[PDB]
């Protein structure tokens, strides 16, 4: 009811299914891995509801996988029966502040049982701290919030590829069995008109030797395979016969250099494939292999069988010989056809649960090896479960899991929507998967199967285009790992209120309609003709009652960031991509305002993210305050939510939270009590809504650049807090300890003016570049005073002391008012790393205002740098004086093919000035009256879903019937354009101009970050050239193409100085500095040092690279 603030909806179709829990992907996966109360509650709920679900948890499953270890005598056994958790010792807030990985204990009961002793000894053991995942799906590790992102991988199973070889002039077919863990195997038919097998592609071999190596005899082989001439030819050409002969031959081919051994060959073949450890096919692997090969109910869990191998032979040859339908071996009739890898039925997401499960599985494998080795080197009756298990591998792996992982990414908190988008991304890059260099055209490209399972619109535009994508809006994860999507049920042409979740394969069999298709007053189809999609991404129509499923919501194919955009349908896919990728960078502002026009889904995108602080009870607020808010339920429980205030995010932006509720207002569960960064009344707000007018203006908005008033600077409309944090450590070195002290040596008196007693800057002391933050002094250095220093000290009678100043200073080009300082002391109860006696961190916070260079942008991929901030007067104002807050080049919108923003501007103008529509008897008027958005007061937000947005007739009519803003006239003409009086020359612009309200964000490409410069600064060691980066005063790179351009100009002297004097010449740099300051002419450049490095290095490879002159030896 009061879940969200009122937002007029322009939608035309009612939605049966609501958007699911938008964060379900992470929380449900990790609940399953933990197997805690929530997961099993969900499991029993599904079971009583009849829905399938894995009844066995993630942790207990991997434990049960490790059977009790058996020595060579098999006398003893260790059973890991039950696992359990305890509450974590450190609070989440404590962990974040004190740099502790949020974790809890994980105990397990180990039972030692020995037949020789005939006794059972049970004892509980503890394998180490387990990184837990908070309720907002972030692993707070080392005080930093990480998030683990899913991973797209080819599911294990059989894959058949059909290709054409130009040399052969004939089709070629290949097969590959891709396991979950084990080594790989391939099956290529008619490579040269014969079939062969790749056992890890070791060597050339036939199929006949393989089958003979198996117990299957030649007679039964030809009896089953007498109907395909390729295999009869292969059999007859194979001279070798007999199982023993084949086995020894294949062993010799696989492992040459030793005489063949029958028993060793058999055990090798069993180990490589049949062993349940080396070839543990995943549950998804068998689940798909049984469906593909058609075998009816094979073993649910296990390795491939000889039956499976022969079935694969038969399927492959049936595919080759051209028959399209064949009887499945020990199975029903099935289509035999090539299968494309790119289809999303073959792509599986490794949710975080499976990732951490694989890592802990590897750790337990190392633990198993360690305990087996210990068993082999331990005596009986001195063995207890407590002592034998070494917990080092599991902890070392789950800790190295977060490190060096392409999947454990630093969380981005630029805004709640960046958070959600980083949660939902399905990163194709990572270990055991599609890497950057392996990338091809096919993988990146969209596929028909992606619809509803992977948004094709949004993805990074960098070199990893398309590899990383955001899940669809309604996507849900199949327990095996494939991605589902809902569809409504249709029967006898009647759409029913039932929903079924279809995966990427079950979709193909049926025909799916479109949600946009109109429906009559009854539940039947209004029109016989209706667009549908079918197998292979076809789009052919099928009129009348033939469909069985239809999309439940038109926004299914679009992800959260893309669903935000209004009038999305009108924008080109490229500009929508840029608009959705941009919107993961808008920084929160001082006072966030919800967009005047925007998709109605922003409320869900706000509430679902974990930044907003909502209530878990339905009570009456009792004490509302800035720091905290107290709520009281009818039961009696009191809870005080503690709102964060100006605490640094990952990217260095404030996370200030407002309070919206009054004193005595009634609350309901899940309702939003406190607003978050970039939010308003619980609705998303990543920017403000400015008055935009499209016109070129003196060239200050040439090439897409932006012009905005000084009103935004003046009224604080676009301004963002920024909190930087930099810290120092008082570490103990060989010579002595470092002292954090106020008595800095060799300093003036006024520099240490605002320092506190122990050498800490006071709170609130505005700082600038060069100021002293925390005072620190070196213990001692071996000082050999130079003659000049000695003489000067003698004249002035100052004692140069061993203690030297190394105190932290504000980095150059930085301003701000300190807000909070933290100190951690060794001698105190606080724990620190070794060596560091004391640690100090200081928070410098500033209020950056929108300025020149600070990148600004809209929603539809229109972005620009500010070029000039005119005074409010110079802005071309409206007929009623309202100066337009921002100008924008119009030359953009036609060429860039994003005409959505013009519709957005018009609709925003409509939203700002309300409208009344009653009894107009117009088609658009009737549509609005039935929708209910007929009488709208000024200023109320208005919502246009991403694919059921306002129609252009509606906008035209509403513009005709806008509320008179003053004196009875509408400043905008029916065309959507208004009279603009130029503020500067004063004279009215010759023709009307388009004007309205557009939602503009402030991106994170602020000029203060980008601005860098260097006179002279640090240098590198191995090569003396200047080092890179901004933090270290790094010069810009004069790369190869720059010297190409300079050589093209013929300017050789400039190249010489840019390559020798200005870097890479140690003798030249001090010389040029001295020459400039003294005014003396620049000296002659020498030889660079990098060339000397090369000469020595090439002299270390035994090449006597001797520099020589025409007349004998050269002088250097």
Partner 1 sequence: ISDIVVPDAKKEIVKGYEGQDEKVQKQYERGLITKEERTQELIAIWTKATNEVAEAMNDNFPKTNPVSMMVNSGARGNMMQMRQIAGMRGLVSNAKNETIPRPIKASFREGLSVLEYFISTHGARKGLADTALRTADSGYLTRRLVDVSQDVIIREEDCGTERGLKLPIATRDADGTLRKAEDVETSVYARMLAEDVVIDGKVIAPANVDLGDVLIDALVAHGVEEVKTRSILTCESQVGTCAMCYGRSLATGKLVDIGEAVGIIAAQSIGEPGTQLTMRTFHTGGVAGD
Partner 2 sequence: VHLVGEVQKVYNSQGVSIHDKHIEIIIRQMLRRVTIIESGDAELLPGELVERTKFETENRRVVQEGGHPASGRPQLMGITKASLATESWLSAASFQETTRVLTDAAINAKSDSLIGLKENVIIGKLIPAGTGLSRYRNIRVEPTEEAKAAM
Partner 3 sequence: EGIINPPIDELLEATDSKYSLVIYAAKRARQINAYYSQLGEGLLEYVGPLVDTHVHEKPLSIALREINAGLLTSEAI
Which residues would be at the binding site for partner 3 (CB under 8 A)? 1050, 1053, 1078-1081
Q: How many residues form the binding site for partner 2 (CB under 8 A)?
A: 21
Distances (CA, A) of 506 to 337, 450, 479: 17, 14, 15
CB atoms within 10 A of CB 118: 7
Count of CA atoms in the C-beta half-sphere (13 A) of 86? 10
Q: Whole-angstrom Cα distance, residue 675 to residue 140?
A: 23
Distance, in Å, from the CA atom of 840 to the CA atom of 343, rounded to the nearest integer, reads: 54
Give 751: exposed, middle or buried? Use CB within 10 Å, 0-12, 13-18, 19+.
middle
CB of 1065 to partner 2, least distance (A): 8
Handedness of CA 756, 758, 761, 763 (dihedral sign): negative
Residue 1048 touching partner 1 (CB under 8 A): yes
Shortest distance (Å) from residue 578 CB to partner 2: 24
Q: Which of 528, 1051 has the CB closer to partner 2?
A: 1051
User: Distance (Å, rounded) from C-alpha 572 to C-alpha 578?
Assistant: 10
Output the CA torsion sign for 1038, 1040, 1043, 1049.
negative
Residues 6 or more apart whose Cβ sits within 8 Å of residue 1087: 1060, 1065, 1116
CB-nearer residue toward partner 1: 447 or 859: 447
CB of 1084 to partner 3, least distance (A): 11
Q: Choose the contact partner of 1056 out of partner 2, partner 3, partner 1, none; CB within 5 to 8 A by kind.
A: partner 2
Binding flag, residue 1098, partner 2 (CB under 8 A): yes
Residues 417, 955, 995, 1003: which binds partner 1 (CB under 8 A)? 955
859 binds partner 1 (CB under 8 A): no
Minimum distance of partner 1 from residue 465's CB (angstroms) = 5
Q: How far is the CB of 1060 from partner 3 (least distance, A)?
A: 17
Shortest CB 896 distance to partner 2, Å: 20
Pick the closer one to partner 1 by CB: 476 or 555.
555
Shortest distance in whole angstroms from residue 1080 CB to partner 3: 5
- For residues 490 and 512, the answer to whether their CB atoms sit within 8 Å is no
CA angle (289 as vertex; 288, 291 as ends), nearest 5: 65
| Calpha distance 936→922 (Å, rounded) | 17
Q: Report yes or no: 790 and 799 within 8 Å, Cβ to Cβ.
A: no
Q: Are strands 408-410 and 425-427 parallel, antiparallel or unpaired?
A: unpaired
Instruction: Give the nearest distance from C-beta 1023 to partner 1 in angstroms.
Output: 22
Of 28-57, binders to partner 1 (CB under 8 A) are none
Please give the C-alpha separations between residue 804 and each of 742, 743, 754, 770, 800, in angstroms, as whole numbers: 13, 11, 21, 17, 9
In 858-951, which residue ranges form alpha helices assigned H by DSSP? Answer: 892-896, 900-912, 923-931
787 binds, among partner 2, partner 3, partner 1, none (CB under 5 to 8 A by kind): none
CA distance 334 to 70: 44
**Residue 537 found at the interface with partner 1 (CB under 8 A):** yes
Q: Which does 540 bind (CB under 5 to 8 A by kind): partner 3, partner 1, partner 2, none?
A: partner 1
* Least gap, CB of 1081 to partner 3 (angstroms): 5
User: Whole-number minimum distance, CB 1024 to partner 2, in Å?
Assistant: 13
**Phi then psi dihedrals of residue 211, to 5 deg:** -65, -45
Region 1053-1082 residues binding partner 2, contact defined as CB under 8 A:
1053, 1055-1056, 1059-1060, 1064-1065
- Give the β-pairing of 185-189 and 196-199: antiparallel
Query: What is the arrangement of strands in the sheet containing 628-633, beginning at the earlier edge strand?
Result: 619-624, 628-633, 638-642
Nearer to partner 2, 234 or 1063 (CB): 1063
Q: Is residue 465 within the footprint of partner 1 (CB under 8 A)?
A: yes
Decide which of partner 1, partner 3, partner 2, none touches 906; Cβ closer than 5 to 8 Å per partner kind: partner 1
Candidates 668, 785, 1043, 1076: give the one binding partner 2 (CB under 8 A).
1043
CB of 569 to partner 1, least distance (A): 4
518 closest CA partner among 537, 539, 495? 495
1059 binds, among partner 2, partner 3, partner 1, none (CB under 5 to 8 A by kind): partner 2
949 sits near partner 1 (criterion: CB under 8 A): yes
Residue 460 in contact with partner 1, rule: CB under 8 A: no
Which of partner 1, partner 2, partner 3, none lies near 1080, with the C-beta cut-off 5 to 8 A by kind? partner 3
One character per residue 688-727, x = contact with partner 1 (rule: CB under 8 A): ----------------------------------------
1103 binds partner 2 (CB under 8 A): yes
By CB under 8 A, residue 472 contacts partner 1: no
Tell me phi and psi for residue 562, to 5 degrees.
-75, -35
Task: Report the candidate in 746, 63, 59 with the shortest Cα–Cα distance to residue 354.
Answer: 59
Provide the 8-state DSSP code for 245.
H
Residues in the chain: 1116
890 touches, from partner 3, partner 1, partner 2, none (C-beta below 5 to 8 Å by class): partner 1
| Choices 281-289, 453-461, 608-616, 712-720 (CB under 8 A): range interacting with partner 1 | 453-461
Residue closer to partner 2, measured from CB, 47 or 1098:
1098
User: What is the Cα–Cα distance from 40 to 32, expressed in whole angstroms?
Assistant: 8
Rule CB under 8 A: is residue 544 a binding residue for partner 1? Answer: no
The enclosing H or E element of 978 equals strand 977-978
Q: Where are the alpha helices (DSSP H) in 167-294?
A: 207-213, 218-225, 229-237, 243-254, 262-269, 283-293
Q: Which does 1064 bind (CB under 5 to 8 A by kind): partner 3, partner 2, partner 1, none?
A: partner 2
Stretch that binds partner 1, among 14-22, 777-785, 918-926, 945-953 (CB under 8 A): 945-953
1081/1110 with CB nearer partner 3: 1081
* C-beta closer to partner 1: residue 196 or 554: 554
In whole angstroms, give the CA distance from residue 199 to residue 279: 14
Is residue 1024 involved in binding partner 1 (CB under 8 A)? Answer: no
- Contact, 935 vs 6, CB < 8 A? no
1025 interacts with partner 2 by CB under 8 A: no
The DSSP string of 533-573 is: E-GGG------STT--EE-S-TTTT--HHHHHSTTGGGS-H
> Of the candidates 1047, 1074, 1080, 1097, which one interacts with partner 2 according to CB under 8 A?
1047
Residue 1085 CB, nearest approach to partner 3 (Å): 14
Please classify residue 972 by burial: count the beta carbons closer than 10 Å to its beta carbon, then call 0-12 exposed, 13-18 middle and 19+ buried. buried
Which among partner 3, partner 1, partner 2, none contacts residue 4 (Cβ within 5 to 8 A by kind)?
none
Question: Distance of CA 762 to CAs 152, 646, 780, Å?
Answer: 51, 18, 27
1071 binding partner (options partner 1, partner 3, partner 2, none; Cβ < 5 to 8 Å by kind)? none
The SS3 of residue 724 is: strand
| 186 interacts with, out of partner 3, partner 2, partner 1, none, CB within 5 to 8 A per kind | none
Residues lying near partner 1 in the complex (CB under 8 A)? 164, 166, 441-442, 444-448, 451, 456-457, 459, 461, 463, 465-466, 514-516, 531, 533, 537, 539-541, 551, 554, 557, 567, 569-574, 577, 890-891, 894-895, 897, 899, 902-903, 906, 947, 949, 952, 955-956, 974-977, 994, 1040-1041, 1044-1045, 1047-1048, 1050
Tell me which residues touch partner 2 (CB under 8 A): 1043, 1047, 1049-1053, 1055-1056, 1059-1060, 1064-1065, 1085-1088, 1091, 1098, 1103, 1108
């Amino acid at each position: 009811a009061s879940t969200a603030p009122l937002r007029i909806s322009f939608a035309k179709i009612k939605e049966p299914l609501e958007v699911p829990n938008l964060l379900a992907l992470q929380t449900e996966s990790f609940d399953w891995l933990l197997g805690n109360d929530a997961w099993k509650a969900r499991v029993e709920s599904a079971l009583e509801s009849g829905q399938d679900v894995p009844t066995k948890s993630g942790l207990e499953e991997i434990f049960e996988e490790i059977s009790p270890i058996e020595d060579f005598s098999g006398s003893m056994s260790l059973t890991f029966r039950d696992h359990r958790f305890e509450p974590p010792k450190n609070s989440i807030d404590e962990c974040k502040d004190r740099d502790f990985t949020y974790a809890a204990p994980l105990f397990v009961t180990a039972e030692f049982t020995n037949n020789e002793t005939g006794e059972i000894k049970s004892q509980t053991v503890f394998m180490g701290d387990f990184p837990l995942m908070t309720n907002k799906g972030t692993f707070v590790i080392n005080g930093t919030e990480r998030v683990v992102v899913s991973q797209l991988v080819r599911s294990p199973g059989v894959y058949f590829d059909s290709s054409i070889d130009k040399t052969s002039d004939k089709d070629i077919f290949s097969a590959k069995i891709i396991p979950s863990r084990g080594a790989w195997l391939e099956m290529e038919i008619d490579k040269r008109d014969m079939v062969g097998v790749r056992i890890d592609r070791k060597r050339k071999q036939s199929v006949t030797v393989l089958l003979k190596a198996l117990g299957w005899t030649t007679e039964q082989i030809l009896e089953e395979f007498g109907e395909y001439e390729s295999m009869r030819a292969t059999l007859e050409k194979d001279h070798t016969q007999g199982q023993d002969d084949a086995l020894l031959d294949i062993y010799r081919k696989l492992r040459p250099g030793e005489p063949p051994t029958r028993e060793a060959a058999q055990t090798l073949l069993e180990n490589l494939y049949f062993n349940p450890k080396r070839y543990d096919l995943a549950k998804v692997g068998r689940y798909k292999v049984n469906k593909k090969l058609g075998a009816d109910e094979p073993l649910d869990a296990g390795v491939l069988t000889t039956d499976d191998v022969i079935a694969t032979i038969k399927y492959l040859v049936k595919l080759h010989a051209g028959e399209t339908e064949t009887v499945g071996e020990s199975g029903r009739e099935i289509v035999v056809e090539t299968d494309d890898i790119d289809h999303f039925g073959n792509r599986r997401i490794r949710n975080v649960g499976e990732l951490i499960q694989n890592q802990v599985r590897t750790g337990l494998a190392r633990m198993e090896r360690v305990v087996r080795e210990r068993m082999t080197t331990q005596d009986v009756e001195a063995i207890t479960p407590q002592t034998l298990i070494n917990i080092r591998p599991v902890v070392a792996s789950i800790k190295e899991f977060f490190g060096t992982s392409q999947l454990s990414q630093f969380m981005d908190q630029n805004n709640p929507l960046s958070g959600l988008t980083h949660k939902r991304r399905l990163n194709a890059l990572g270990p055991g998967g599609l890497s950057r260099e392996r990338a091809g055209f096919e993988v990146r490209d969209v596929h028909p199967s992606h619809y509803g399972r992977m948004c094709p619109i949004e993805t990074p535009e960098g070199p990893n285009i398309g590899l990383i994508g955001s899940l669809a809006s309604y996507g849900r994860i199949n327990p095996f790992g494939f991605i589902e999507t809902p569809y409504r049920k249709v029967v006898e042409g009647q759409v029913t209120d039932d929903v079924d979740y279809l995966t990427a394969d079950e979709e193909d069999r049926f025909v799916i309609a479109q949600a946009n298709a109109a429906l009559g007053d009854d539940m039947r189809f209004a029109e016989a003709r209706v667009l549908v999609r079918r197998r292979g991404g076809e789009v052919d129509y099928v009129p009348g009652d033939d469909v069985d499923y239809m999309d439940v919501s038109p926004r299914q194919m679009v992800s959260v960031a893309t669903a935000m955009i209004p009038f999305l349908e009108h924008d080109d896919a490229n500009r929508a991509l840029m608009g959705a990728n941009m919107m993961r960078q808008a920084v929160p502002l001082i006072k966030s305002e919800s967009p005047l026009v925007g998709t109605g889904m922003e409320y869900r995108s706000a509430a679902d993210a974990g930044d907003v602080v909502k209530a878990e009870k339905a009570g009456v607020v009792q004490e509302v305050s800035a720091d905290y808010i107290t709520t009281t339920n009818d039961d009696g429980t009191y809870i005080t939510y503690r709102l964060a205030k100006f605490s640094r995010s990952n990217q260095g932006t404030s996370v200030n939270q407002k309070v919206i509720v009054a004193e005595g207002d009634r609350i309901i569960e899940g309702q939003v009590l406190a607003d978050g960064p970039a939010t308003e009344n619980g609705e998303m707000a990543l920017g403000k809504n400015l008055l935009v007018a499209f016109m070129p203006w003196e060239g200050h908005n040439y090439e897409d650049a932006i012009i905005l008033s000084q009103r935004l600077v003046q009224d604080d409309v676009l301004s963002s807090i920024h909190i930087e944090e930099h810290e120092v450590d008082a570490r103990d070195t060989k010579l002595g300890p470092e002292e954090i002290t106020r008595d800095i040596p060799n300093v003036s008196e006024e520099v240490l003016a605002d320092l506190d007693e122990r050498g800490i800057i006071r709170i609130g002391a505005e700082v600038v570049a060069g100021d002293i933050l925390v005072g620190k002094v070196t213990p001692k250095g071996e000082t050999e005073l130079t003659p000049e220093e000695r003489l000067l000290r003698a004249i002035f009678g100052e004692k140069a002391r061993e203690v030297r100043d190394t105190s932290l200073k504000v980095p150059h080009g930085e301003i701000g008012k300190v807000i909070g300082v933290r100190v951690f002391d060794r001698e105190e109860g606080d724990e620190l790393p070794p060596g560091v006696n004391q640690l100090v961190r200081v928070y410098v916070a500033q209020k950056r205002k929108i300025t020149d260079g600070d990148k600004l942008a809209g929603r539809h991929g229109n972005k620009g740098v500010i070029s000039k901030i005119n005074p409010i007067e110079d802005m071309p104002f409206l007929e009623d004086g309202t100066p337009v807050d921002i100008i924008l080049n119009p030359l953009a919108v036609p060429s860039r093919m994003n005409p959505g923003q013009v519709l957005e501007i018009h609709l925003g103008w409509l939203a700002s000035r309300g409208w009344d529509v009653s009894g107009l008897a117009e088609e658009w008027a009737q549509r609005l009256q039935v929708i209910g958005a007929d009488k709208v007061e000024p200023g109320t937000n208005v919502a246009t879903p991403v694919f059921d947005g306002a129609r252009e007739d509606e906008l035209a009519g509403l513009l005709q019937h806008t509320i008179p803003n003053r004196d009875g006239e509408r400043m905008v003409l029916p065309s959507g354009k208004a009279r603009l009086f130029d503020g500067r020359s004063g004279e009215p612009f010759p023709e009307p101009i388009s004007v309205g309200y557009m939602y503009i964000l402030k991106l994170h490409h602020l000029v203060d970050d980008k601005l860098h410069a260097r006179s002279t600064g640090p240098y590198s060691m191995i090569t003396q050239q200047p080092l890179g980066g901004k933090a270290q005063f790094g010069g810009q790179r004069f790369g190869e193409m720059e010297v190409w351009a300079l050589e093209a100009y013929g300017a050789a002297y400039a190249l010489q100085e840019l390559l020798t004097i200005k870097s890479d010449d140690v003798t030249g740099r001090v010389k040029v500095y001295e020459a400039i300051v003294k005014g003396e002419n620049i000296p002659e450049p020498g030889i660079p040092e990098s060339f000397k490095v090369l000469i020595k290095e090439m002299q270390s490879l035994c090449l006597n690279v001797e520099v020589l002159s025409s007349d004998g030896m050269s002088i250097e």
